[PDB]
Design a protein around this ligand. Structure first.
Ligand SMILES: [Zn+2]
Lengths: 101, 140, 142, 128
RNA sequence: UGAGUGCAGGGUUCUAGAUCUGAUACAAGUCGUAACAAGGCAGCUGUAGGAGAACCUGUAGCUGGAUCA
RNA sequence: ACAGCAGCAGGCGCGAAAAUUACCGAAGCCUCCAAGAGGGCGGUAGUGAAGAGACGUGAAAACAAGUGUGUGUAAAAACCACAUGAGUAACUGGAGGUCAAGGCUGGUGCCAGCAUCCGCGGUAAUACCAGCUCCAGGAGUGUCUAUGAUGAUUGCUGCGAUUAAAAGGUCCGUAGUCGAAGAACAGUACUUGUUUGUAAUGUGGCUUAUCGAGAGCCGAAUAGAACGAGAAGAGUUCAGAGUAAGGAGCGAAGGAGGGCUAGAUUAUUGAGCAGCGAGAGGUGAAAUUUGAUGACCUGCUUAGGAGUAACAGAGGCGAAAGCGCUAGUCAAGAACGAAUCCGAUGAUCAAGGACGUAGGCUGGAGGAUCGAAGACGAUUAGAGACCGUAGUAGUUCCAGCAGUAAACGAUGCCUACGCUGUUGUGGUUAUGAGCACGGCAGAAGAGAAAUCUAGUAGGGCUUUGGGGAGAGUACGCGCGCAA
């Protein structure tokens, strides 16, 4: 029986879409189906900022950040616990997740 | 095909549909005259050539008593079942027997007997029911 | 719906309930009739005649003054074309597509458009050669 | 294009189910007029106005509380006077009430008038 | 006008045949365990190689998926 | 030399299958030169549980079938009348459920058997084999085999195609089936009158055999044809008419739709040269493997062949398959605005024709990355596989062949009637809203449910299914270089 109204993907009014590759296992997954995750990570860890304050030559310094978008296939997303199995009424709830660091 | 002047189209279509029915198909396109008892004849005469026994299908546990018959009208050899309690004892090799159908729509196996399609009715011109129950005797 | 594709557009223009006589205008009957026949002899299609009469001279639908239709007036004046103007515009588009494909042979989309166009030509031809508006053995310019 | 007499029927059937009292029907022909005029004679509909829009035509009608259902038959079968009671028993709910309408050389008539005038015709539609 | 009968061919229906190759039933024999749980490498459709055997591997697709995010 | 029983009896065969080598100057008819002759044509009986009527097998006082006379007939027998004796006369299938009627008594122990179907029996069998009581129909009752019904499981009335079996991968297109409003016209279909057209059978009746089938008489009738009538629907024509039918054209604008020309920022490999002097790679953990002929990492040079990250979405475009860097160029299409033109030009479609991801094949160009086959290293009882090292055909382009996909929203194409709220994309706007293409959330109905491209409905046209298997297989045929 049909488990989801949208077939588990975001394609509508189209024939075909570009593929992308999974970060964890390099499998091909369609772009409109892949699980997506955003990361904004400081170059320097929080446990070093108190040393940075005496190491730097400049009057003040702003740490550089690094930015990423990651893609996962279903198997990897479930195994890494980005997503979890949910009850028949919960399946319908849609909410934006946090940006990781 | 539902128009007022559409009768020819409608007729030809509906005729072609009927071949999907197994019943209509066999009568039209199969070999309906291959059988000793069937479209051809209600009963068949033949001579006994061997005595035989067969296991019942699971889950039953029995040996069923059967006879090899050479059919006069076709020169085929067929298996038939012998109905009654001590029935096999009323038949000798080279006796003549008359043989009858099991009562299904096509020729099909009945009950727990695998692959046997006819049963014995009379031996040497007399009813097998009378022979077994000792109401009458062999012609001798 | 549309004949060669999946379109269901609805853009048309409303025909009036009654037509009257355009008394607000600034020319006579005979002047309007002269304007039409001049534009005709210069070689304009009758749909363009209609556009000019509305836009420049200020007359809607070009019939309220004349009690006669544009193509009928051109037949009365003897200015009738050799081929009806619709069938004529279909042959032109075919020629254009064949002239493109002649130099850009690889274009599968243009090939697709040509077979649609060609079908439409013969469907129109069969109309006119039933109403005796074309000779029975007329064939495309190709 | 849809059949105009079919369109008429679905338009009034749906509006009746939705408990509306009046409707506008958008494409009208000669027999559609005569059908509506029949329903008025037997008191199934109350008021009729016709709009002469120069684009086909349209009608505005008031429904009564007595109308349960109506329908067109397609195609329009030819019937002898011997045949009409067969169709009467197939279409109508009771022997006591309701109308089966037939076209004839004497206009639209009902299954009782067929007996009076001694004429068959072509089957058109029904209401009860 | 022609019966019968020569000699070649065809058209139909049956039947023989060394040997090979399907299917079906095999109480329970031998070797593994491919599917059904994330069935222990998620499964399935097309196509192409390979292999005691279930099947395995590349390429494009699908969720009837382990994700309506 | 003779001869031909699908004439009447009769015989043999063949089969599961069918009567007497009988009487006839009488009945109904036919034949002759006949107040007469002929007829196995026809009639009369004999034989057989094919079918169909009416009645026996007791009553409470008191009952068939026998026999003798007469009748009957061509002669008979049976039938009927009166008179004599008397006291005879039921079986077939069943009893666990469907399905009416016993957990009764004795045997047997998965044996022997029974059972259309479901199922009984392994020592406590209401189901086998018997006894005894009940049930059903009854001069009849069981079985086998064809067929009609059961059956809306063949569907005109009247079934189905999201997931149970079932919508063609997409277009074009002939035959075929189906096709506006307004004003008029004509009678061949259409409907109906009168007249023909049915012996038997059947249908509505009445009358006589004791009754009931039976017999005799009456009335009306199907399809088909002759001559009249009516004109709603169907049909034909017209233009001082111009579809929320189609095609042609105009104006401003929008889009990863397509072909071509000329350019681009990085990245991955390979070579050259320079610096440095010991490890790099890969995994869950490791080994194959590579490095003092200087790896790895960091510079500068170059050579190629692919690709267009992030922006990027329940966003857009295309008939579908599919389409994502920037400029220039070449055709055609969709939608919107509006007092442009022509006038039925249209819907759907066997045959026939054009396109169709990927993988594959024929020839040319080329060859970075990835990688079927093949070869190793590990793991395991064994791995031929999964993992790692390496490596070829292919993966790219031009000219063609091929014709399949879970080619799926598993939902055909036109055309209708239909509740609300919200959010998009492109035009237009009295700024109130609309038109085309979408998403989402309820409701009401619907449906076996899950759910809703599935609500309402004799609108039109094509494809298509009919319990599992064998089988989308065999034989024949058509296309293809082969697959
Ligand atoms: Zn992955």
């Amino acid at each position: 029986t049909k488990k989801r109204s949208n077939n588990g993907r975001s394609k509508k009014n189209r024939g075909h879409t570009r593929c992308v590759r999974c970060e964890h296992c390099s499998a091909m997954v369609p772009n409109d189906k892949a699980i997506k995750k955003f990361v904004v990570r400081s170059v320097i860890d929080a446990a070093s900022l108190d040393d940075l304050k005496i190491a730097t030559i400049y009057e003040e310094y702003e740490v550089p950040k690094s930015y990423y978008k990651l893609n996962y296939c279903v198997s990897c997303a479930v195994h890494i616990k980005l997503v979890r199995v949910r009850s028949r009424w919960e399946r319908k709830i849609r909410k934006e997740q946090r940006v990781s660091a | 095909m539902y128009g007022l002047l559409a009768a020819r189209n409608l007729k030809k279509n509906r005729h072609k549909r009927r071949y999907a029915d197994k019943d209509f198909a066999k009568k039209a396109r199969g070999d309906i005259y291959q059988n000793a008892v069937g479209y051809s004849a209600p009963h068949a005469k033949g001579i006994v050539t061997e005595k035989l026994g067969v296991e019942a299908k699971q889950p039953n546990s029995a040996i069923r008593k059967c006879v090899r018959v050479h059919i006069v009208r076709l020169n085929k050899k067929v298996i038939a079942y012998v109905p009654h309690d001590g029935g096999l004892n009323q038949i000798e090799i080279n006796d003549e027997v008359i043989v009858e159908g099991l009562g299904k729509k096509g020729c099909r196996s009945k009950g727990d007997i695998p692959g046997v399609r006819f049963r014995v009715c009379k031996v040497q011109k007399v009813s097998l029911k009378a022979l077994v129950t000792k109401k009458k005797e062999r012609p001798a | 719906a549309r004949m060669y594709s999946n379109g269901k557009g609805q853009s048309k223009s409303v025909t009036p309930y009654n037509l009257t006589y355009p008394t607000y205008i600034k020319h006579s009957k005979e002047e309007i009739v002269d304007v039409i026949l001049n534009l005709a002899r210069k070689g304009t299609p009758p749909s363009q005649i209609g556009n000019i009469l509305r836009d420049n001279y200020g007359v809607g639908k070009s019939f309220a003054v004349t009690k006669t239709k544009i193509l009928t007036l051109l037949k009365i004046a003897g200015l009738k074309p050799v081929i009806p103007e619709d069938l004529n515009n279909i042959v032109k588009k075919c020629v254009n597509i064949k002239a493109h494909l002649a130099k850009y042979t690889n274009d599968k989309s243009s090939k697709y458009q040509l077979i649609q166009m060609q079908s439409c030509l013969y469907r129109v031809a069969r109309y006119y050669k039933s109403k005796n508006e074309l000779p029975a053995g007329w064939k495309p310019p190709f | 294009m849809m059949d105009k007499l079919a369109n008429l029927c679905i338009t009034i059937n749906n509006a009746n189910r939705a408990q509306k009292r009046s409707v506008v029907i958008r494409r009208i022909s000669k027999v559609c007029r005569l059908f509506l005029e029949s329903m008025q004679k037997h008191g199934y509909i109350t008021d009729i106005v016709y709009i002469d829009d120069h684009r086909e035509g349209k009608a505005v009608v008031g429904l009564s509380g007595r109308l349960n259902r109506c329908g067109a038959i397609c195609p329009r079968y030819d019937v002898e006077l011997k045949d009409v009671e067969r169709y009467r028993a197939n279409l109508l709910p009771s022997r006591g009430f309701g109308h089966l309408i037939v076209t004839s050389s004497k206009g639209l008539i009902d299954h009782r008038e067929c007996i009076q005038h001694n004429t068959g015709g072509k089957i058109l539609g029904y209401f009860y």
